[PDB]
Each structure stands twice: as C-alpha cells, then as structure tokens.
C-alpha cells in the first residue's frame, strides 16, 4: 500500500470508517474469528485429511419423521474449490493447486428404540390422512437477482399482474457480480472468487447505498400512497446532509425519519409508542449493527 493513505493522524479524533474501504468486504480479514477457527479446526499444513459431518438443509426433509418402508435417498456433492473452501484473501482457488476429493462417505441415522406395541399405535396415527406433517421454509422468499450496470444508479423491476394474496413483504440488498455465483448451473466458469459469498452466507455489507425506493402498482396508485410517509410517494432512505432542509435525518446519520420507522416497526414492533433498545435482538437485526459516524474537514481550494 501507499504510505500516506493511513497513519496515526488520519481522521484524528474521529470514529470514521474510510470512504474507500466501505465497499470492500469486511469478512475478508484475518481477525475473522470464524474463518480462523474453521481453518485451524482442520489443521495447519497444506495436505490434510478431513472427517466432517454435513447437514440436510432442505426444509421438507430437514426434520421429517419417517414411517416403515424401504426408501431411496441420493444426493450430489460439489467439487468446486472456490465454492467449498473459503479463503481469507478471496483469490482464485481454481487457479492454483487447490483440490477437494472424496474417498468414502456414509449416512448416519438414529432409530429410537420405541416399544413395538407403542410404535404400532403411533404408526396408525400417522398413516391417517388428517395427521399429515406440515413443514415450511424459514426464509419464505423468492430470490431475484436484478443486475445494476457498472456506474449506473437507477434500476427498474417489473412484475406482470399476479395474485398478490397472502403476500408478506419485500427485502433487498446489493451483491457484487464477482462475489455471487450462479447456482442453477452445474459449474460456474465465470466465478473467480473464493472469499465469503454474501448470497449464501449472511454477511451482507452493501446494505447502504440505497438513496431512493418507490413502489407503484399499475404505473399508478403508489404504495402506501395514503400520505403515510413524510415524503408520501417514495421510500427515501438516504438524504445527504448539505442537501437536507427540514429534519429527515435520524441517529446523527443519513437515514431518514420516515424510513427508520418502518425498519423498527418491521423488526422490533416499535414506532408508535416511542423508541428504545429492544429486549430480544437477533444476529441479523437492525439496531445491533447500525453504526452512525461523523467527522469534519476543512474547506479546500482557497489558501
């Protein structure tokens, strides 16, 4: 690195993240204690044997209870070194001599030693048609990856007319194209990255940079549109200060008054009776990792 970009004087006295390190993946670090623990759990050398236990994450057969019968259970495993292994620097693991191979696997189950006449009553209750087991995906979402071109700002999405009954809500971030693979193919030849994938891990970090947002049903009738918000047509998320005129800036940051409400009301059921720190805070919550910041700069140019 260049010498004068950081030193012990840069933004002195200011809690301020660097303006160019913002759109750089913070999980590609060596203080990433999970990746340091997941790498040292295998070993320290290059050639290592491993002996791992992987789950079944598909929700219908995640915790299904089976009745007697002969069943057939096949599944395909990956061999892509960029996908299976995670690197700290996030280089190409396909380029160098990184390779995974499988010598033998086997499936383990646990049969509960139930009494043979207690099971004969519990089987009959589950062969019944009114005792069918229901399961649901925890996320309950439809993935859609709309592409922003390089250097552009406005992206329009268009859904033709559907049911929209029992619809639950929206959710959105940004994901780098180089850091997001294509899972629908058997192999992605344009996937040259091997750090943390934010599409598969949690690890979102571009949740800022979302200046505006507007929802509109039939190229008319904006949503919510009943003069609910402060700016009632669109969901304004950021408004940069030196352009703001009247409030619209929570938390000593750029986040607006109307949109900070609909995040605390969605996540933590607040907004109408005063804000506070909530009791139960999840790992992917809002107020846990929302971090505002500020600094000052002298005016430049003249003298």
């Amino acid at each position: 690195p260049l010498p004068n970009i950081v030193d012990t004087w840069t933004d002195i006295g200011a809690r301020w993240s660097l303006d160019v390190m913002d759109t750089v993946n913070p999980f590609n670090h060596h203080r990433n204690t999970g990746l340091k623990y997941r790498s040292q759990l295998l070993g320290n050398g290059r050639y290592c044997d491993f002996h791992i236990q992987v789950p079944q994450k598909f929700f219908a057969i995640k915790n299904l209870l089976l009745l007697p019968g002969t069943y057939n259970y096949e599944w395909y495993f990956r061999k892509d070194p960029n996908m299976v292994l995670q690197s700290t620097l996030g280089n190409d693991l396909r380029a160098d001599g990184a390779s995974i191979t499988y010598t033998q696997i086997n499936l383990y189950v646990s049969f509960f030693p139930m009494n043979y006449d207690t099971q004969s009553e519990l089987e009959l209750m589950l062969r019944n048609a009114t005792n069918d087991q229901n399961f649901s995906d925890y996320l309950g979402a439809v993935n859609n990856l709309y592409q922003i071109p390089a250097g552009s700002s406005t992206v329009v999405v268009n859904i033709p007319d559907r049911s929209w009954g029992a619809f639950r809500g929206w959710s959105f971030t940004r994901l780098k194209v180089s850091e997001t693979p294509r899972i629908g193919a058997t192999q992605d030849p344009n996937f040259q990255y091997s750090g943390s994938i934010p599409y598969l891990d949690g690890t979102f970090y571009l949740s800022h940079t979302f200046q505006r947002c507007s929802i509109q049903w039939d190229s008319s009738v904006p949503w919510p549109g009943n003069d609910r918000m402060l700016t009632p047509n669109w969901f304004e998320i950021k408004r940069p200060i030196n352009q703001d005129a009247e409030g619209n800036d929570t938390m000593q940051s750029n986040l607006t008054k109307d949109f900070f409400m609909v995040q605390m009301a969605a996540s933590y059921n607040q907004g109408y009776q005063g804000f506070n720190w909530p009791n139960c805070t999840k790992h992917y919550g809002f107020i846990n990792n929302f971090e505002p910041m500020s600094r000052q700069v002298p005016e430049y140019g003249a003298n």
């Binding site: 019968g69 999405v157 029992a166 979302f210 938390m251 009301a265």
Partner: protein, 97 residues
C-alpha cells in the same frame, strides 16, 4: 487553540448483515405472519402488476441487487402405506413466477 474555521460536517452510516425489509402491512407492524393486507379483498381477489424502481449509489463494477419477496412456502406430506410417500408443494402467492 488554532483550529481551522469554516469547516463542514459529513455524516454516513454503515449497515452490515441486515437486508432492509419493507413489510406489506397497513401500519408496518407485526400483527401476524399472514399480514392484514395479505387477506384484504382488494389485493387477493384482483390482479395487479408491480413497477418498483430503485436508486443506488454508483459503483465501479457490476452489481446484482438481491430482491426478496415474502411468500409463504409450505408442504404437506402423507405416508398412507408402507413404502409409500407423497407430498404437495404449494406457495402463496408466487406459484412458479
């Protein structure tokens, strides 16, 4: 003692791991998993399109936006006979969209 005058303040915020959410509710609260507008007669028994444009900051390289629609993904499964199993996959509202 000799600080430079006429200096200007700059604000920003960093949000990690969050995935901004917009609930499809009338008062934006969690009154139920099935929201109140989801069983509204205006939206259930009628067909509406969706035009939804965004505005992001420009970057130096291409970028996907990970748009998620809250749907209700459900299964049932019956096992009526030994060595017999069957399911029924069905989600509201985006059945094969």
């Amino acid at each position: 003692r000799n600080a430079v005058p006429n200096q200007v303040t700059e604000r920003k915020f960093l949000v990690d791991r969050y995935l901004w959410q917009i609930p499809f509710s009338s008062n934006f609260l969690n009154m139920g998993t099935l929201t109140d507008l989801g069983q509204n007669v205006m939206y259930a028994n009628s067909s509406h399109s969706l035009n939804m444009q965004f505005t992001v900051d420009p970057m130096t390289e291409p970028t996907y936006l990970m748009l998620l629609f809250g749907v209700f993904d459900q299964v049932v499964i019956n096992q009526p006979t030994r060595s017999g199993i069957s399911v029924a996959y069905l989600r509201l509202p985006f059945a094969s969209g």
